[PDB]
Amino acid sequence: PQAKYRHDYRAPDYQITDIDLTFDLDAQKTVVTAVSQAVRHGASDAPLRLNGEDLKLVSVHINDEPWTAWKEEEGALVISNLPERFTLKIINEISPAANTALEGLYQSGDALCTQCEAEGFRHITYYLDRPDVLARFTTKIIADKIKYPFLLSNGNRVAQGELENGRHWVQWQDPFPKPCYLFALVAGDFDVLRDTFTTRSGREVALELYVDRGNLDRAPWAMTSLKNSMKWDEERFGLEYDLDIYMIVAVDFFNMGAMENKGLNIFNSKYVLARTDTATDKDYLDIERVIGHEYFHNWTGNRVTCRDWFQLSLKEGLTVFRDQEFSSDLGSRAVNRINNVRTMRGLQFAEDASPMAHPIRPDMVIEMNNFYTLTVYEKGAEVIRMIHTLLGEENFQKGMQLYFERHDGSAATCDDFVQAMEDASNVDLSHFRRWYSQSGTPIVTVKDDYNPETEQYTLTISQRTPATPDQAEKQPLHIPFAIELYDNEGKVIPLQKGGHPVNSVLNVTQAEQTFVFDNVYFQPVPALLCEFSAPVKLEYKWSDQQLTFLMRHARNDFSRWDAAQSLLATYIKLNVARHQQGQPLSLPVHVADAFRAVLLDEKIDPALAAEILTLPSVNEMAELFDIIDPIAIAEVREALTRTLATELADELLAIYNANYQSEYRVEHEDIAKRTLRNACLRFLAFGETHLADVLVSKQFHEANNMTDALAALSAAVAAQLPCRDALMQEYDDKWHQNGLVMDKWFILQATSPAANVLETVRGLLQHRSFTMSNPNRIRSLIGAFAGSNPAAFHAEDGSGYLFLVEMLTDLNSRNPQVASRLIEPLIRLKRYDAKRQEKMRAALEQLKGLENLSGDLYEKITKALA
Numbered sequence: 091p092q093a094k095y096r097h098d099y100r101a102p103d104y105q106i107t108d109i110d111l112t113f114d115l116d117a118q119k120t121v122v123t124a125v126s127q128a129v130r131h132g133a134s135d136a137p138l139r140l141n142g143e144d145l146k147l148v149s150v151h152i153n154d155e156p157w158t159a160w161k162e163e164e165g166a167l168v169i170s171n172l173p174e175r176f177t178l179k180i181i182n183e184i185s186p187a188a189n190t191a192l193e194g195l196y197q198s199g200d201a202l203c204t205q206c207e208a209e210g211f212r213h214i215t216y217y218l219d220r221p222d223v224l225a226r227f228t229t230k231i232i233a234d235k236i237k238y239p240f241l242l243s244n245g246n247r248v249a250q251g252e253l254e255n256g257r258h259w260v261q262w263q264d265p266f267p268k269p270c271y272l273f274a275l276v277a278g279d280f281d282v283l284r285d286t287f288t289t290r291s292g293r294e295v296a297l298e299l300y301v302d303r304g305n306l307d308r309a310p311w312a313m314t315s316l317k318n319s320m321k322w323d324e325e326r327f328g329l330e331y332d333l334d335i336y337m338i339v340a341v342d343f344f345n346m347g348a349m350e351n352k353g354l355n356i357f358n359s360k361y362v363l364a365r366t367d368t369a370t371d372k373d374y375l376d377i378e379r380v381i382g383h384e385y386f387h388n389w390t391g392n393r394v395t396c397r398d399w400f401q402l403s404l405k406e407g408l409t410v411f412r413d414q415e416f417s418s419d420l421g422s423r424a425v426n427r428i429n430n431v432r433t434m435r436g437l438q439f440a441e442d443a444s445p446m447a448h449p450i451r452p453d454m455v456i457e458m459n460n461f462y463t464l465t466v467y468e469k470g471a472e473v474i475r476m477i478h479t480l481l482g483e484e485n486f487q488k489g490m491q492l493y494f495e496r497h498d499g500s501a502a503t504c505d506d507f508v509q510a511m512e513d514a515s516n517v518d519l520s521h522f523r524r525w526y527s528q529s530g531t532p533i534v535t536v537k538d539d540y541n542p543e544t545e546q547y548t549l550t551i552s553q554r555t556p557a558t559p560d561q562a563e564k565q566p567l568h569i570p571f572a573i574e575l576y577d578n579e580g581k582v583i584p585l586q587k588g589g590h591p592v593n594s595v596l597n598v599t600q601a602e603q604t605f606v607f608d609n610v611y612f613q614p615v616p617a618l619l620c621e622f623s624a625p626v627k628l629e630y631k632w633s634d635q636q637l638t639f640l641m642r643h644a645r646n647d648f649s650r651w652d653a654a655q656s657l658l659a660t661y662i663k664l665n666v667a668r669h670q671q672g673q674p675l676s677l678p679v680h681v682a683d684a685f686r687a688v689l690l691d692e693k694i695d696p697a698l699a700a701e702i703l704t705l706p707s708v709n710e711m712a713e714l715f716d717i718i719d720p721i722a723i724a725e726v727r728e729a730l731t732r733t734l735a736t737e738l739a740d741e742l743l744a745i746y747n748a749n750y751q752s753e754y755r756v757e758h759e760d761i762a763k764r765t766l767r768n769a770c771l772r773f774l775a776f777g778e779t780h781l782a783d784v785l786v787s788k789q790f791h792e793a794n795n796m797t798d799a800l801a802a803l804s805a806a807v808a809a810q811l812p813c814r815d816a817l818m819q820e821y822d823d824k825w826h827q828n829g830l831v832m833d834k835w836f837i838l839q840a841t842s843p844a845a846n847v848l849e850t851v852r853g854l855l856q857h858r859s860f861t862m863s864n865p866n867r868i869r870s871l872i873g874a875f876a877g878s879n880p881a882a883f884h885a886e887d888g889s890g891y892l893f894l895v896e897m898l899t900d901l902n903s904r905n906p907q908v909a910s911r912l913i914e915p916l917i918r919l920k921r922y923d924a925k926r927q928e929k930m931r932a933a934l935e936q937l938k939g940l941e942n943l944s945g946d947l948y949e950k951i952t953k954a955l956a
């Protein structure tokens with residue numbers, strides 16, 4: 091498979107302006123008729139090159155003339171000797187039932203549905219399957235009425251009819267030109283939740299949520315969240331919905347989360363269905379965020395689209411920024427910020443050190459579906475947030491407005507977006523643009539000096555980015571570096587210099603620079619990189635007491651949590667070294683006392699307290715280390731939990747009890763209290779065994795919501811408590827028919843600390859609730875093993891690697907997109923010791939040798955083995 095390069099972009103030789111589709115739908119054989127209106131822009135001698143995959147061509151006509159000047163080639167239909175303007179008619183056949191890759195038109199249970207992003211429309215018909223070709227669609231769907239009573243496409247219904255033999259049809263039209271990746275079709279039998287939203291200006295929009303029969307009891311939160319998204323986008327961004335109907339369809343078989351198809355979003359049912367007995371607080375907030383995200387794409391992705399796929403972050407960084415701002419405004423901003431920074435530092439930084447490292451605007455891609463990444467998404471959003479930090483809200487919104495003014499109805503680039511922000515704000519972003527083209531994580535080193543004679547405080551700040559596997563050359567970035575300086579009473583020292591205030595966002599633009607601040611009347615405790623102001627590693631030689639000071643005094647909740655993380659990081663490192671030497675956990679008394687203080691502080695928001703009391707995950711821990719020792723990290727995480735459980739036992743139990751709530755509500759204050767209570771229960775579970783067993787089994791049985799029941803269950807598994815097997819079996823017996831609920835259980839199984847975990851996981855491939863045909867089940871059993879139990883996955887015997895190879899041998903043929911997500915933990919081999927690295931290399935070499943290796947895996951394996 092040959093790579094494609096960003097620098098190779100050229101405008102298309104032909105455009106399509108209008109496409110009329112007809113589908114004669116049947117799961118074994120669907121016939122597609124596509125009538126396109128095309129215009130040649132290039133040279134008269136250049137052929138029309140259409141993309142297509144696994145299509146059976148029936149006929150090709152040009153202005154109703156059966157055409158002879160064409161040829162099929164790999165991936166393509168090449169049509170020669172065309173007029174400047176013409177009607178193209180293609181008829182072709184496709185097989186939805188055969189589509190196990192879930193790309194194009196496929197089956198989800200008994201429903202037929204589509205996934206077209208990035209390049210799935212070419213699995214439906216021969217087309218210009220590139221996002222700078224925007225066309226007006228009309229879609230006619232013909233099908234069996236009993237099997238497919240609902241026939242859905244983008245837009246509004248324009249025509250409807252009934253035919254003989256029990257067939258009927260519906261035709262849709264969407265007035266807004268779109269790239270084909272935003273085409274959708276759904277056919278099936280559903281329950282339908284119907285509601286309305288009226289826009290600020292008075293447009294009434296019909297809201298329709300399509301769910302499998304018998305799932306309406308699980309649909310109201312998603313509808314609520316849709317309406318909240320619509321309202322928020324009006325309030326915050328000034329953006330209203332632009333069509334008459336908003337349809338969402340929840341499907342059980344879907345490789346990703348959800349898809350922003352215009353007016354007809356298609357969602358993984360995981361990100362729609364919730365009721366208090368089936369879904370946790372986190373599930374509710376994820377549904378909220380994903381419903382928001384897809385809605386927000388209506389402007390940032392649909393009304394303004396991407397010129398080419400290398401501009402994916404244009405829509406995805408910006409839409410993730412918007413989903414984060416939505417969740418943060420409606421809920422806890424500090425909890426959101428903290429979790430997004432957890433993701434950045436613990437997952438995204440690992441990608442940016444890996445063989446798959448790329449800038450947020452990639453330069454080279456083999457399989458575009460491989461570039462829907464933590465980088466493009468989460469680091470993309472940090473890049474947008476940095477523009478917000480440099481511009482401020484008012485100017486950022488001026489930029490958004492200029493962006494839409496300029497680019498509405500078109501496909502644009504990252505550069506276009508940055509230009510709009512520059513022009514609207516008058517802030518120069520020329521240097522800042524390097525964030526789009528340079529990969530890797532910057533390391534920012536800070537030294538300080540306080541001169542009591544002059545009352546000056548000097549920060550010496552340096553930056554460098556290590557070379558990455560993709561780029562041997564690195565240059566300094568424009569790093570917005572926010573600070574705050576605290577005196578001895580915990581008061582903020584005004585920043586100034588030469589008689590003038592100094593903005594607290596320092597512009598760190600050089601490899602090394604100094605910043606001097608005057609009238610600094612007391613040696614400061616600095617808070618550095620406030621609200622994680624740039625996506626960088628910070629190196630500052632913190633004392634423990636500076637960190638516990640910030641935990642008590644810092645004005646922003648984020649900085650209190652970040653200080654806590656720095657305090658723990660020293661001790662995590664210490665204790666992984668100790669584990670390697672066979673020595674027990676060591677923790678200073680003063681460190682435990684800091685966490686005691688957080689537990690007993692009546693002033694602190696319980697939402698913040700819960701996050702300070704949630705230890706970094708094994709993935710966050712691994713980023714502290716050049717070479718990862720995954721057994722040490724897992725065992726130190728457990729031992730640190732057990733140490734704090736012993737040292738804080740009375741305080742944990744008192745806070746656990748104080749935060750008991752007898753009413754369950756999905757409301758942010760209630761969620762906060764519950765997250766704190768359950769953070770205490772986690773430590774209590776690793777305390778004295780009989781008390782732990784009693785507390786956990788009682789919570790499990792007495793819980794009136796899944797949040798609390800799962801928190802107990804998860805604690806029983808993590809602490810290997812006596813009640814574990816009984817509780818695990820009770821859950822299975824109650825919920826085995828409900829795959830989304832069983833996914834939680836599969837995750838618990840795959841992440842168990844138990845010595846025979848892999849044997850249990852392999853046995854669960856035969857479980858009644860497991861199937862290799864369903865991406866969510868795969869993710870929850872196999873993905874969770876490989877990605878979230880790096881201790882068992884990295885068992886010294888190599889057994890974890892071999893297991894994954896067998897699963898990937900299946901999945902390469904069945905569903906390469908899922909396979910490619912699942913290979914990720916093997917491509918991180920260079921972070922492990924030599925013996926592990928040799929085993930992981932041999933696993934990659936076995937996969938490189940598969941017959942019919944997918945492009946998706948080929949790209950990752952070749953980079954990993956370089």
Ligand SMILES: COc1ccc(C[C@H](N)C(=O)O)cc1
Binds near residue numbers: 406
């Ligand atoms: C291969 O199938 C998909 C690829 C991408 C997505 C993400 C969606 N655009 C979003 O950003 O939510 C969805 C599906």
Ligand SMILES: [Zn+2]
Binds near residue numbers: 383387409
């Ligand atoms: Zn998106």
